[PDB]
Structure 1
Amino acid sequence: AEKLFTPLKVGAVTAPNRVFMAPLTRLRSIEPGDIPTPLMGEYYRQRASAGLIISEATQISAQAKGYAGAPGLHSPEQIAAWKKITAGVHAEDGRIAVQLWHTGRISHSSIQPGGQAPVSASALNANTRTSLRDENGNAIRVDTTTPRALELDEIPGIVNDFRQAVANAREAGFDLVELHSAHGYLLHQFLSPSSNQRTDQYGGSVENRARLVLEVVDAVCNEWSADRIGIRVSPIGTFQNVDNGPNEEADALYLIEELAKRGIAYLHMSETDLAGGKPYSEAFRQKVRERFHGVIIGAGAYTAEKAEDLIGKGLIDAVAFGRDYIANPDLVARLQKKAELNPQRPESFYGGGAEGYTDYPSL
């Protein structure tokens, strides 16, 4: 019966199981330089039995930065450090995708180049908080800075920054990329009418609001290959940073139909904020499944039992676990053996060092 421990072709790679590691911001990179570390390499290597590791959100550019301690994939030193991390995963016969973001308005002027306002679709504060570092290097929360709206002639540069970051990801040895089009970051700021009041061709209709993300998809497929590209969306519900507007189901199905035309490797649906939301209806899952023929990854407070049920129904192909992967490097073996999980320590999810990061034991 069990399908979680069977292989799955995911674009250009083949996962040996359906138990994926969700992208997890942990804010442990080196500053200055937003540089991945050998400790981050150890953490990912410990989890390399995952069917697929999806990395923490990683900046496409310095402007993309919104959190102190989040890594980039735009500088030589970042590329060199990520090469070591992907090599370590591959040494253990793993597969790893890099999640690429621009945080847009979920950012703060103090970590923007030049100390000026971050950018977005419109000049509306997100009215939330991001993460900085205090003078001792510890993670602190700070109110987001009001963004400025991207001028029309700046949008090709944003598309080019995603393209360049994917070129860099290929050099750095990643198996796949995941475009971060979820959770209220820049691509989702354009997608949502709540964060996008533009009157040019990047605002208004759903076609206009999806224009930027689809330009990015086309640019990165052209740069590398469609079967190397995944995308994460969170198109139903309210996320800390944004909501999906009054026609969220129709708009989501429009976007998914467009993504399918590009033949990309996978659609990763983040179904809920950590703070909760209404479950996806099975009717909606069927409409998604019939618009996207490729791999569908479900995430958001999943259990192994919920994953088996939906995989068995043919509605998703894999599950990404977030917090269970923080706490269980060998989550695959634990789920296969029905072993107990280590307890989670959420106080060390963000920032710090090895404690709460590489010190969760394997069986």
Structure 2
Amino acid sequence: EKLFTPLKVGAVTAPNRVFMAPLTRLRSIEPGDIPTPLMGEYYRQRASAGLIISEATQISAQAKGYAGAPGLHSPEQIAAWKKITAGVHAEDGRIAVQLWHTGRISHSSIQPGGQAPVSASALNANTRTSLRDENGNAIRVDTTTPRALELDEIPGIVNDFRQAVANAREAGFDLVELHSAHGYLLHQFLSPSSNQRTDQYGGSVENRARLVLEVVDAVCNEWSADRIGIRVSPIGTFQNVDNGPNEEADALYLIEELAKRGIAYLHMSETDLAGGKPYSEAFRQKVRERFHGVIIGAGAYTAEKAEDLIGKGLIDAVAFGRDYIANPDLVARLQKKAELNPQRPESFYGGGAEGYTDYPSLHH
């Protein structure tokens, strides 16, 4: 077993390789997109993780695409997150904040001014996002057609990432994870399917990767490269965003560029929940050749698959999603080969304590 051995992840040391994947749960307070004490309890319960990666969290109000997703842009949000990180640290845990801009996976009703959300191009996502009804319950609603960002608005987006990372540092997070996956704004620029721009932010892979690399450079300069992770989903299709006709080459280009910045980690979301073709060991080897920091894998991993690939030297850590929803002490359960609690997917999104903080540990 290597799963229960330590790993240096940039500025922090994880005591094990069992990480909590970023998991949107849509339980924040509105108005204000404010994290809550209940969210604090949930994260605290999971503090034995090698690393907790938070739910996706808005860099700005414009970034919002889901009712109930938290922000890290306002004073009230910063204060609330400070309490949550303090609780995780009281239990000797480590926590990263996942930072996103949802771009076109959003709805006008939750945007500033009730206006169309923004993206690389004016193309509808053709999916749904999660809003709230008049009683605060989660509902699924078709995405609004976005507006293409003007060239002159791009520096603002970079600055919003920079500022959110500054705020993350003040809020007591150990690391930040840039959400460059799953069809959200950074991925909308990366993908030729969602990016039809003719300026320097569209066309070639160098141009499509330009925004994400500008963000990486800004956040490394704001804090430190060893505080910065990035999540990518560069092989396959995610929320209708494919990775284009040269997905492997384009992925390896991006990864070679990221490596130059000396960032803490590369987190690869390998498939969506509906599944897809597995990563080849040859592709994994090509990623290792190009990236010199920690590599985290995710997507329907079992402990067995995680040990296999860590043992093979191809990845360093595994982020578990749904098993972490259901097992606050997943580390201990995996280490002892104990049964896991059953999952209740009906309470993944929205609601309250039920299906959130009521999954038990092995022992009380």
Cα distance, 1:156 vs structure 2 = 0.1
- Residues 217-243 of structure 1 show CA distances to partners (whole Å, capped at 9, x for unaligned) of 000000000000000000000112411
Q: Distance in 2 between matches of 1:182 and 1:263?
A: 20
Matched-pair contact (CA < 8 Å) for 1:127–1:143? yes
Cα distance, 1:6 vs structure 2 = 0.3
Q: Distance in 2 between matches of 1:332 and 1:241?
A: 33
- Residues 132-154 of structure 1 show CA distances to partners (whole Å, capped at 9, x for unaligned) of 00001000000000000000000
Q: Distance in 2 between matches of 1:195 and 1:238?
A: 12
Matched-pair contact (CA < 8 Å) for 1:109–1:145? yes
Q: Report the counterpart of residue 74 of structure 2 in structure 1.
A: 75
Please show how residues 3-14 of structure 1 align to structure 2 within 5 Å. Answer: 3-14=2-13
SS of match in other structure, 1:54: strand
SS of match in other structure, 2:109: helix
Q: Distance in 1 between matches of 2:90 and 2:153?
A: 41
SS of match in other structure, 2:122: coil
Q: Report the counterpart of residue 20 of structure 2 in structure 1.
A: 21
SS of match in other structure, 2:140: strand
Deviates more, 1:233-242 or 1:157-166: 233-242
Matched-pair contact (CA < 8 Å) for 1:106–1:241? no
Q: Distance in 1 between matches of 2:336 and 2:311?
A: 20
Cα distance, 1:119 vs structure 2 = 0.1
Q: Distance in 2 between matches of 1:203 and 1:154?
A: 15
SS of match in other structure, 2:38: helix
- Residues 337-356 of structure 1 show CA distances to partners (whole Å, capped at 9, x for unaligned) of 00000000000000000000
SS of match in other structure, 1:207: helix
Matched-pair contact (CA < 8 Å) for 1:105–1:146? yes
SS of match in other structure, 2:189: helix
Q: Distance in 2 between matches of 1:315 and 1:61?
A: 35
Q: Distance in 2 between matches of 1:297 and 1:289?
A: 11
- Residues 20-60 of structure 1 show CA distances to partners (whole Å, capped at 9, x for unaligned) of 00000000000000000000000000000000000000000
Q: Distance in 2 between matches of 1:150 and 1:277?
A: 31
Q: Distance in 2 between matches of 1:312 and 1:359?
A: 34
Q: Distance in 2 between matches of 1:238 and 1:276?
A: 10
Matched-pair contact (CA < 8 Å) for 1:52–1:95? yes
Runs of 4+ in 1 over 2 A off after TM superposition: none
Q: Distance in 1 between matches of 2:274 and 2:248?
A: 20
Q: Distance in 2 between matches of 1:114 and 1:240?
A: 26
Please report the TM-score for the alignment, with normalisation by the length of structure 1.
Answer: 1.00
Matched-pair contact (CA < 8 Å) for 1:83–1:172? yes
Matched-pair contact (CA < 8 Å) for 1:226–1:265? yes
Q: Distance in 1 between matches of 2:152 and 2:236?
A: 31
SS of match in other structure, 2:262: coil
Cα distance, 1:61 vs structure 2 = 0.1
Please report the TM-score for the alignment, with normalisation by the length of structure 2.
Answer: 0.99
Cα distance, 1:308 vs structure 2 = 0.3
Q: Report the counterpart of residue 332 of structure 1 in structure 2.
A: 331
Q: CA RMSD in A?
A: 0.3
Cα distance, 1:293 vs structure 2 = 1.1
SS of match in other structure, 1:135: coil
Q: Distance in 2 between matches of 1:291 and 1:310?
A: 17
Identity %: 100
Q: Distance in 2 between matches of 1:84 and 1:272?
A: 33
Cα distance, 1:64 vs structure 2 = 0.1
Q: Distance in 2 between matches of 1:26 and 1:337?
A: 28
- Residues 78-118 of structure 1 show CA distances to partners (whole Å, capped at 9, x for unaligned) of 00000000000000000000000000000000000100000
Q: Distance in 2 between matches of 1:275 and 1:48?
A: 29
Q: Which runs of 5+ in 1 are unaligned?
A: none
Cα distance, 1:169 vs structure 2 = 0.1
- Alignment coverage as a number of residue pairs: 362
Q: Distance in 2 between matches of 1:18 and 1:156?
A: 36
